[PDB]
Amino acid sequence: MKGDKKVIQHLNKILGNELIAINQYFLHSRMWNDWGLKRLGAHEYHESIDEMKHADKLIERILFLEGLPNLQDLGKLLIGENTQEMLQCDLNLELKATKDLREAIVHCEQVHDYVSRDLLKDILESEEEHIDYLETQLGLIQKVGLENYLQSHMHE
Amino acid sequence: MKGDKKVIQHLNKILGNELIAINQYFLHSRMWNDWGLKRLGAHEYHESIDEMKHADKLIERILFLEGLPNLQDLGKLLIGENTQEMLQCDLNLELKATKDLREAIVHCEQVHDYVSRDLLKDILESEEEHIDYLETQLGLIQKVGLENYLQSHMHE
Amino acid sequence: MKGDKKVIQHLNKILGNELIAINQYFLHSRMWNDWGLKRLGAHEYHESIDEMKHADKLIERILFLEGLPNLQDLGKLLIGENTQEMLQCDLNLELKATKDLREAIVHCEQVHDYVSRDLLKDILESEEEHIDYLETQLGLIQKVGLENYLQSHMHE
Amino acid sequence: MKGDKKVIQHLNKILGNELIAINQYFLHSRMWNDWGLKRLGAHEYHESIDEMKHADKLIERILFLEGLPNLQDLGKLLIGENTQEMLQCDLNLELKATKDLREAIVHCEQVHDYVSRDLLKDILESEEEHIDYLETQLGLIQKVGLENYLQSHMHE
Amino acid sequence: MKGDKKVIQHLNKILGNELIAINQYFLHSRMWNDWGLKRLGAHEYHESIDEMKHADKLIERILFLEGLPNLQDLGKLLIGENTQEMLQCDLNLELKATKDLREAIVHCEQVHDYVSRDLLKDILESEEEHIDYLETQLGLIQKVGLENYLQSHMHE
Amino acid sequence: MKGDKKVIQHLNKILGNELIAINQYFLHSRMWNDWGLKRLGAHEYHESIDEMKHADKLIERILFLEGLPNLQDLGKLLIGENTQEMLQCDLNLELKATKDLREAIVHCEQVHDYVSRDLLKDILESEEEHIDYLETQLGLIQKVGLENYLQSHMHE
Amino acid sequence: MKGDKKVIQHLNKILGNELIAINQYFLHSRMWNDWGLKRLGAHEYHESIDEMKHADKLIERILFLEGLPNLQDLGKLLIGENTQEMLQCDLNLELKATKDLREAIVHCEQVHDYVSRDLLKDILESEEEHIDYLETQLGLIQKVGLENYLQSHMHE
Ligand code: HEM
Ligand code: HEM
Ligand code: HEM
Ligand code: HEM
Ligand SMILES: [K+]
Ligand SMILES: [K+]
């Protein structure tokens, strides 16, 4: 079904953000696992999987709309060097992701692509839930102290 | 455990090949699904998952050896425009992957990193299994005809 | 709960499209079954049942909004004479149906009938899935040949 | 129990034919699997297993009759280069085998070795069933065409 | 996948050793069963089956590497005339097999056919397990006496 | 089966290292249990058992190769007196152990004892898993602080 | 709980005896397994395990009493070269062990370490059970002859 060219451009932009997130979260997961912070590693692994599922749906939607999914262009991964930085890197990424999702939803609405809008809204709900998690972790580091926070994330 | 710097470079190079293949096979899978060739789409999805698992193991090995996994530098995806082309693109990628695997194994052997060698040998066994599958599909297209071959791959 | 009069008019227009689709898809189903193409016959039956469920929900919404559902005025059935024509007739109907659905959503949004919009978005998702199915069938006819395509739809 | 010398010679000749068939069918099975014709590959594997079981019983009978089973002399394997040739190679071998079985049964009857006769009759029944299969496959190649015939033997 | 021509020659040489062992061990098994030494007969049967499985894997590897498996050129079976000779004939055969396996692995390693090497290594582990069994049996014949050793192998 | 004399000397050297590790880990386990650090105690017990299993396989291999396993010449145990030193003592022992394993594998490869090499490779994989655990634990003490680290290991 | 210094020295002497017995019984077990005498191998393995469990209770008691368990000094292993010698070597060790256990119990009684006495009495009961087994095996060899005795210990 021939989709709107600019919708497909927006879907490829969102897809690009998801492809960054997949790799960034997966590396952060395996870094936390390497450091013995297995609760963080497991949670971050599930974040990466969730972004994979979003990327899948975007690819499927782009192809149904007769566009070409772009899995070639990979933007800048924000890789931290310690737990505080890694969480903030994920948070910085997610805030760019939600800006772009809101702009894509506007455009879907204007060309009456209400199904693509509904998909993007679902992805946006998932990204805001990730923001909630991240902001909460950063707040907990302040409330319990960094050593306690990390200790609490050693064991699953 | 401090690894050989050149081993780590080889492992990042293999990881780079797996990252290409993850994206190429995943896109090929969703294209075949979109065209109604669901048996191909499902098979190619499982190939993409297999590459994801190899990438995971490579990432974990690099970190254990105190290297920096490189998920940033994505190489060229070989995307076909029809089934015959897509299969040949996968095969071309696999032949490059196995050449690089052999060179990495040689080096691991020379520096006595026998555990990295064992990992890469397992990955090489998986890639040769993919080559077998790909060569066989191309052969079947010649034996049964393209139209029959595609017909046989419509339904799961 | 007294609804917007033009919303009710749009809902009755969507219902009119669903009532055409029920009969067209049911007759095509039974034609394919009579011809021994039982996989087409069964899939088309399920498409007709889906339209019946949509019509049900539209009738219920119209009555809740204190309008009069119009089940009396049946528009033109597009009945094919062979498989390719029947599929294209279904696709022509669906493209008209999605056009009307989008115009109805616009009007729901403008007068703040957000629940009617949500119902119509869900129906639109179902109709786009049928379009995907129909487009894929027509494409498969070109990839495997009509004779193979019909062969693959003889048996459930 | 001391058997007739010529009966034992016949049994060793039948054994020699089965030993050829084991290897021929096993190699054909693995050729078909390598080509992705897994249904032919699996069926031919079962034909090879059936010949293994006959060879076992012949070896046991020879040893009971105080003869020396000959597993050393292996006659000529008829290996085809395509599916039609492999099937005909199997058939030609089976037609020789049943001729030799009939001559061995004649001699068993003459010297009153009714138990060896019964064994050979059971083996002959298996070989005629294999002939039925082979002639049927070659007939189906003619009825449905080679491309369809091979298509129908891709998947188990 | 086109393999190294000398690798393929080594694989056919290993395959030829497996084919001798299949026949030698099967015949020894059935001789022991005929003599009422059913525990030896059963264990020897399972040795033959294991060699059949190795032969299968070699045939498959050879075909994947685009060589022609040789099931035609059967070398010399070493058939004993009593239990002590049969075991020693098996051991003599296994010691030649392991020599040939080691030389094949050397070459696989030199030309980087690491998957063929892995297969050969697995086969060599099975062959060394058989050597262990055979050497132990000959030691037991000394330690318990021939009469007791045979008595211990009458019943399963 | 007569083994290479120097291979057997390497195997006895690896055995000696496992024999040290069995006792060191078992004592460290029981010290941690006595101190109320039961999670360390249990994990360290499982490390000792794994070393026991490696020593068993080494003894079995040495005897098969017709060597004399040396369980008499116990080398120096590295017994720590607090948690951090105990972990570092285990790490120091493992680093010596993997150095010896690599030298033994080199020699196995040179004399073509590929089964001994495969055994030592499996043992090296286990010791590298232990190194990974140990390095992770020492890193955790730095990240969460010694008092929290110990706290987290009081309870199973 | 600070224990009597000479009690602790006795406990370490008993521990030393158990440590010799662990290795001596484990090697004898694996020697019998290598020779095909698996019932002897299995029983001697279970004797080695029993001594391992005694050593564990002695290590735990010494630590509780605030002594230092000595796992470093290994006394002389009495390794036999044939079954009779191996059993007698085990018996000679056990008789030295029970002599040392009796002197240890005398001293525990004198200084009122009744709990250590109870542990040593339990170990003494196990060692006297092992002496029973060993004396009985040596007696059976005399009654049934070594060849029959070994025959009866081939299969588990
Ligand atoms: C560095 C790149 C990637 C890595 C390391 C990775 C890793 C993984 C792993 C380990 C799994 C679990 C496999 C299993 O055990 O079953 C998985 C699942 C999955 N991946 Fe990826 N992946 C990557 C990229 C992608 C991309 C780019 C996509 C899609 C565009 C994707 C789509 C999926 C899906 C759909 C699943 C299954 C999720 C489910 O459980 O439903 N992955 N991935
Ligand atoms: C040509 C006109 C129609 C035909 C031939 C037809 C046929 C059928 C058939 C054969 C079934 C399955 C019943 C069963 O076996 O249990 C069914 C179910 C149903 N029909 Fe129709 N129908 C028609 C029109 C309609 C209309 C106009 C509506 C609503 C406005 C409707 C609503 C439904 C509903 C709600 C179901 C139950 C579906 C479910 O939940 O499984 N049908 N119809
Ligand atoms: C090229 C030579 C041969 C090959 C590749 C081969 C291969 C095989 C394989 C793969 C199996 C199934 C094993 C399993 O997974 O359980 C099998 C079974 C068997 N083979 Fe062979 N074989 C060969 C020769 C022989 C010969 C020469 C004999 C007898 C003289 C024989 C007797 C049997 C028997 C009795 C079975 C078990 C059948 C059953 O399931 O009852 N085979 N063979
Ligand atoms: C030559 C040195 C040793 C060898 C080869 C050895 C071997 C073994 C083996 C093979 C097992 C069974 C493991 C399994 O499959 O789960 C085991 C268990 C065990 N070992 Fe050792 N071991 C040795 C020394 C020791 C020592 C020195 C101690 C204590 C100081 C010890 C304490 C234990 C314990 C407590 C068990 C568990 C027994 C049970 O409850 O089942 N072992 N050993
Ligand atoms: K705390
Ligand atoms: K006896």
> Position of tokens 């786009």?
C128
Is residue G33 within 8 Å of residue G41, measured between CB atoms?
yes
The protein residue with its alpha carbon nearest to ligand 3, atom 28, reads D52
Is residue A10 within 8 Å of residue A107, measured between CB atoms?
yes
Ligand with smallest separation from the Cα of A48 = 1
SS3 state of residue B98: helix
Q: Which subunits count as partners of chain B given 3+ CB pairs below 8 Å?
A: A, C, D, E, F
Who among E23, E34, E72 is closest to D63 (CB)?
E34
Angle of CA points F129, F133, F139, to nearest 5°: 140
> Position of tokens 């994990």?
F43
Task: State in Å: Cα C49 to ligand 2 middle.
Answer: 6
CA distances from G143 to A73, B63, C101 (A): 85, 65, 99
Annotated binding residue D94: yes
Q: Do chains C and E touch (3 or more CB pairs under 8 A)?
A: no
Ligand with smallest separation from the Cα of C59 = 2
* CA neighbor of C105 nearest in space, from C115, C91, C95: C115
Q: Do D74 and E77 touch (CB under 8 A)?
A: no
Breaks (C-N over 2.5 A) in chain D follow: none
Task: State in Å: Cα F26 to ligand 4 middle.
Answer: 9
Is residue G32 within 8 Å of residue G156, measured between CB atoms?
no
Give all strands (DSSP E) within G58-105, no chain letters: none
* CA neighbor of A115 nearest in space, from C123, C103, C133, B32: C123
Annotated binding residue E82: no
The best mutation among D19, D26, D49 to test binding of ligand 3, ranked by most ligand atoms within 8 Å of the C-beta, falls on: D49
Resolution (A): 1.9
Which element (helix H / strand E) includes A118?
helix A114-144
* CA neighbor of A41 nearest in space, from G7, B63, E2: B63
Neighbours of A46 (CB within 10 A): 11
Q: Which residues of F touch E (CB under 8 A)?
A: 1, 64, 112, 114-115, 118
Instruction: Compute the half-sphere exposure of residue D19: CA atoms within 13 Å on the CB side of its CA.
Output: 26
Neighbours of G112 (CB within 10 A): 10
Query: How distant is the Cα of E144 from the closest Cα of chain G, in angstroms?
Result: 4
Q: Do B26 and A72 touch (CB under 8 A)?
A: no
d(CA D30, CA E15): 14
Annotated binding residue G94: yes
CA distances from E144 to E147, G47, G84 (A): 8, 24, 14
Residues of E in contact with D24 (CB under 8 A): 71
Q: Do B151 and D151 touch (CB under 8 A)?
A: yes
Q: What is the 3-state secondary structure (H, E, C) of chain F?
A: CCCCHHHHHHHHHHHHHHHHHHHHHHHHHHHHHHCCCHHHHHHHHHHHHHHHHHHHHHHHHHHHCCCCCCCCCCCCCCCCCCHHHHHHHHHHHHHHHHHHHHHHHHHHHHHCCHHHHHHHHHHHHHHHHHHHHHHHHHHHHHHHCHHHHHHCCCCC
d(CA E53, CA E42): 17
Query: How distant is the Cα of F145 from the closest Cα of chain A, in angstroms?
Result: 7
Task: State in Å: Cα F148 to ligand 5 middle.
Answer: 5
Q: Which residue of A has its CA nearest to B31?
A: A63
Burial of D46: CB neighbours in 10 Å, binned 0-12, 13-18, 19+: exposed
* CA neighbor of F78 nearest in space, from F119, F17, F129, F136: F17
Is residue B92 within 8 Å of residue B122, measured between CB atoms?
no
d(CA C8, CA D33): 63
Neighbours of G6 (CB within 10 A): 14
Neighbours of A122 (CB within 10 A): 12
Tell me, using a 6 A CB cutoff, whether residue B55 lines ligand 1.
yes
CA distances from B57 to B50, B60, B64, B69 (A): 11, 5, 11, 11
Which element (helix H / strand E) includes G102?
helix G83-111
Neighbours of F114 (CB within 10 A): 22
Burial of A147: CB neighbours in 10 Å, binned 0-12, 13-18, 19+: middle
Ligand with smallest separation from the Cα of C24 = 2
Q: Which residues of B touch C (CB under 8 A)?
A: 34-37, 147-148, 150-151, 154-155
d(CA E88, CA E79): 10
The best mutation among G27, G33, G49, G61 to test binding of ligand 4, ranked by most ligand atoms within 8 Å of the C-beta, falls on: G49
Q: Do A63 and B23 touch (CB under 8 A)?
A: no
The best mutation among A20, A22, A24 to test binding of ligand 1, ranked by most ligand atoms within 8 Å of the C-beta, falls on: A22
Burial of G27: CB neighbours in 10 Å, binned 0-12, 13-18, 19+: buried
* φ, ψ at G60 (rounded to 5°): -65, -40
Tell me, using a 6 A CB cutoff, whether residue A60 lines ligand 1.
no
Q: Domains in chain D and their CATH numbers?
A: 1-156 (1.20.1260.10)
Q: Which subunits count as partners of chain F given 3+ CB pairs below 8 Å?
A: A, B, E, G
* CA neighbor of G30 nearest in space, from F60, E71, A135, C46: F60
Breaks (C-N over 2.5 A) in chain E follow: none
Q: Closest ligand 2 atom, CA of C23?
A: 1
Annotated binding residue F52: yes
Q: Do D27 and E74 touch (CB under 8 A)?
A: no
Ligand with smallest separation from the Cα of D29 = 3
d(CA B100, CA B11): 10
CA dihedral defined by E101, E103, E106, E112, rounded to 10 degrees? -70
Query: How distant is the Cα of C46 from the closest Cα of chain B, in angstroms?
Result: 18
Identify residue C40 by its one-letter amino acid code: L
Is residue F19 within 8 Å of residue F62, measured between CB atoms?
no
Tell me, using a 6 A CB cutoff, whether residue A53 lines ligand 1.
yes
* CA neighbor of A152 nearest in space, from F38, F143, G79: F143
Q: Which residue of F has its CA nearest to G22?
A: F71
d(CA F103, CA F106): 5
Instruction: Compute the half-sphere exposure of residue E121: CA atoms within 13 Å on the CB side of its CA.
Output: 21
* CA neighbor of D71 nearest in space, from G84, C79, E20: E20
Residues of D in contact with B152 (CB under 8 A): 151, 154-155
* Six token digits for residue B150: 């595609």
The protein residue with its alpha carbon nearest to ligand 4, atom 23, reads F52
* Six token digits for residue F62: 């040495």
* CA neighbor of D87 nearest in space, from D38, D137, D42: D137
* CA neighbor of A84 nearest in space, from A47, A134, A45, A128: A134
* Six token digits for residue E112: 């980087």
Who among E136, E139, E148 is closest to G151 (CB)?
E148
Is residue D129 within 8 Å of residue D98, measured between CB atoms?
no
DSSP B92: H
Tell me, using a 6 A CB cutoff, whether residue C115 lines ligand 2.
no
Task: State in Å: Cα A144 to ligand 5 middle.
Answer: 9
* CA neighbor of B117 nearest in space, from B130, B104, B136, B131: B104
Who among D34, D37, D151 is closest to B148 (CB)?
D151
Method: X-ray
* φ, ψ at G137 (rounded to 5°): -60, -40
Q: Do B147 and C148 touch (CB under 8 A)?
A: yes
Task: State in Å: Cα A18 to ligand 1 middle.
Answer: 12
Residues of F in contact with A34 (CB under 8 A): 136
DSSP G13: H
What per-residue string of b and e applies to F134-149 under the rule 16 or more CB within 10 Å gives b? bbbbbebbebbbeebb
SS3 state of residue B4: coil
Annotated binding residue C125: no
CA distances from F24 to F52, G17, G69 (A): 12, 18, 11
Q: What is the 3-state secondary structure (H, E, C) of chain E?
A: CCCCHHHHHHHHHHHHHHHHHHHHHHHHHHHHHHCCCHHHHHHHHHHHHHHHHHHHHHHHHHHHCCCCCCCCCCCCCCCCCCHHHHHHHHHHHHHHHHHHHHHHHHHHHHCCCHHHHHHHHHHHHHHHHHHHHHHHHHHHHHHHCHHHHHHCCCCC
Q: What is the 3-state secondary structure (H, E, C) of chain D?
A: CCCCHHHHHHHHHHHHHHHHHHHHHHHHHHHHHHCCCHHHHHHHHHHHHHHHHHHHHHHHHHHHCCCCCCCCCCCCCCCCCCHHHHHHHHHHHHHHHHHHHHHHHHHHHHCCCHHHHHHHHHHHHHHHHHHHHHHHHHHHHHHHCHHHHHHCCCCC
CA distances from A101 to A64, D58, F67 (A): 20, 76, 70
* Six token digits for residue E50: 């294991």
Is residue C121 within 8 Å of residue A118, measured between CB atoms?
yes
Task: Considering only the C-alpha atoms of chain F, give the largest distance between any 2 of them, rounded to a whole number of Å.
Answer: 55
What per-residue string of b and e applies to A72-109 under the rule 16 or more CB within 10 Å gives b? bebeebbbbeebeebbebbbebbeebbebbeebbebbb
The protein residue with its alpha carbon nearest to ligand 1, atom 32, reads A52
* CA neighbor of C48 nearest in space, from C28, C71, C33, C62: C28
